[PDB]
Structures are given as C-alpha cells and as structure tokens.
C-alpha cells in the first residue's frame, strides 16, 4: 500500500539503479554514430567462421547480461525476494532487458548497431547463419527506437520487464506481484508527470519479448548441435547457465 511520496522515491531509485548499471553512457553511443565499419571490415566479419562469430556474440551478450544482473541487485525490493525467485526472474528476464537496452545502441537513421567498437548493419552478422533471428532483433530495435525513449523511461520499463510476477517457478508469487504493482505505478506516474502516457499503447506485448528469447535459444541449439565442443570449451559459463541449462 504505497503512497505518492513513496512512488516518487521509487522513480528516482530505479532511474539511479539504471544509470549506475549502464554498460555504455547514451552520450558515448550517440557520439560514436559516424564511426561505421568500412566495406572491407564488413567483408572481414562475413568471412569469419560461424563458430568464431557465435563465440564473439555470446561473449558480447554475456557482458551485457552481467550489467543486467547488477541492475537487478540494485533494484529496490529485488534482493528482498528469495534466491530461487531472484534466479527465476533473471533467467527469464535478463535477455529481455538486454534486448530492450539494445535500442540505445541502434541507429534508426542508417539501421546499424554498435558492436565491437563501431556501427555495423545486419549484414555484419551473416556468418552466424541465423538471418531470421538477426533481422527480428533489428526490426524490434527499430520499432523501439521510434518511441524515442528517454533514459528514465528505459530504466522504469526495464525494471518492469524484469519484475514479472507471471514467470513460471516463482515461490513468493504475491511478493513479486506487489513489487511489480509498485514499479508499474512508478512507471505510469512518471509517464503521467512528463505527458508521455501515449507510449503505453506503443510498447511491445510481452509475447514479442518471449518470441525473441525463444528464437535465440532455438538458434543456439542448432549451433550447439553443429559445434558442441565450441559451446562446451569456448562459450562463457554465465551464457550456458542462462541458455543451455548449465
């Protein structure tokens, strides 16, 4: 039973937790927009082996996930849930938060994403052999970029993506519903205060984030069948914990 004063404190707390756990400052990503991979560099990426490209991408995803774990740990009320629930929420939601955070590193003007120090198009990722997954992620990032999120809106929205009381496996489901309700109030209060309530209808449905995560696990399984020793010997242990089952 949170009050208006407590709701405003929650807004500031979430926004602070987010700013502290950004891998890249938004200003740094915007200032790098003219730093684009040349045609020779794109060709170099396309000539990389499928296994080398998968390992590089899994490493980059793992680094991004580590920041999401830290965001969760700083998130008001998350560390108060039992460890089983903390792990359920991170296993189901870490990739979804990374997918939303990715729109900051996406330049809708030329359809490029910041990857390994420069901006490149989806053609940079051709060696992975998961064209449908890559194009869906780029489409998703393009659609989110059209919302023109502020950093505070991403902070509030990503807190809600993570604190989802519907995840299967939660033991303290009511405690999570209460935290989710308070974060929903904080988010909707901020939108109301900044006259941005129009974005509510424009946010992706939860099924969209679920579809993208499911496609990622499916393409990982195909790669794992082709190069099992690459996954075992060369994929990050956190990545295997979240997406292979250890």
């Amino acid at each position: 039973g949170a009050s208006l004063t407590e709701i405003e404190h929650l807004v500031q707390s979430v926004c602070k937790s987010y700013r502290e756990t950004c891998q890249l400052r938004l200003e740094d990503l915007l200032r790098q927009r003219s730093n684009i991979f040349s045609r020779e560099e794109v060709t170099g990426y396309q000539r990389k082996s499928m296994w080398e490209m998968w390992e590089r991408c899994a490493h980059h995803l793992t680094e991004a996930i580590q920041y999401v774990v830290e965001f969760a740990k700083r998130l008001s009320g998350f560390m108060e849930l039992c460890q089983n629930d903390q792990i359920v929420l991170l296993k189901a939601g870490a990739m979804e938060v990374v997918l939303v955070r990715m729109c900051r590193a996406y330049n809708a003007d030329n359809r490029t994403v910041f990857f390994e120090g420069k901006y490149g198009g989806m053609e940079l990722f051709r060696a992975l052999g998961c064209s449908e997954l890559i194009s869906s992620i780029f489409d998703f990032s393009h659609s989110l970029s059209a919302l023109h999120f502020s950093e505070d809106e991403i902070a509030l929205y990503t807190a809600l993506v993570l604190i989802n009381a519907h995840r299967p496996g939660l033991q303290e489901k009511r405690k999570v519903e209460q935290l989710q309700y308070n974060l929903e109030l904080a988010f909707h209060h901020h939108l109301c205060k900044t006259h941005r309530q129009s974005i509510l209808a424009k946010l992706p449905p939860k099924g969209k984030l679920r579809s993208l995560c499911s496609q990622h696990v499916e393409r990982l399984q195909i790669f794992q069948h082709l190069h099992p020793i690459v996954v075992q010997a060369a994929f990050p242990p956190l990545y295997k914990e979240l997406f292979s089952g250890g």
């Binding site: 774990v69 740990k73 460890q83 792990i87 296993k91 956190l238 914990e241």
Partner: peptide
C-alpha cells in the same frame, strides 16, 4: 553456479 555467485558477491 555463476548466477548464485554474482547474487552472493557483496
């Protein structure tokens, strides 16, 4: 293993 360690490391 990893997730438990990250969550415990204060």
């Amino acid at each position: 293993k990893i997730l438990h360690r990250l969550l415990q490391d204060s």
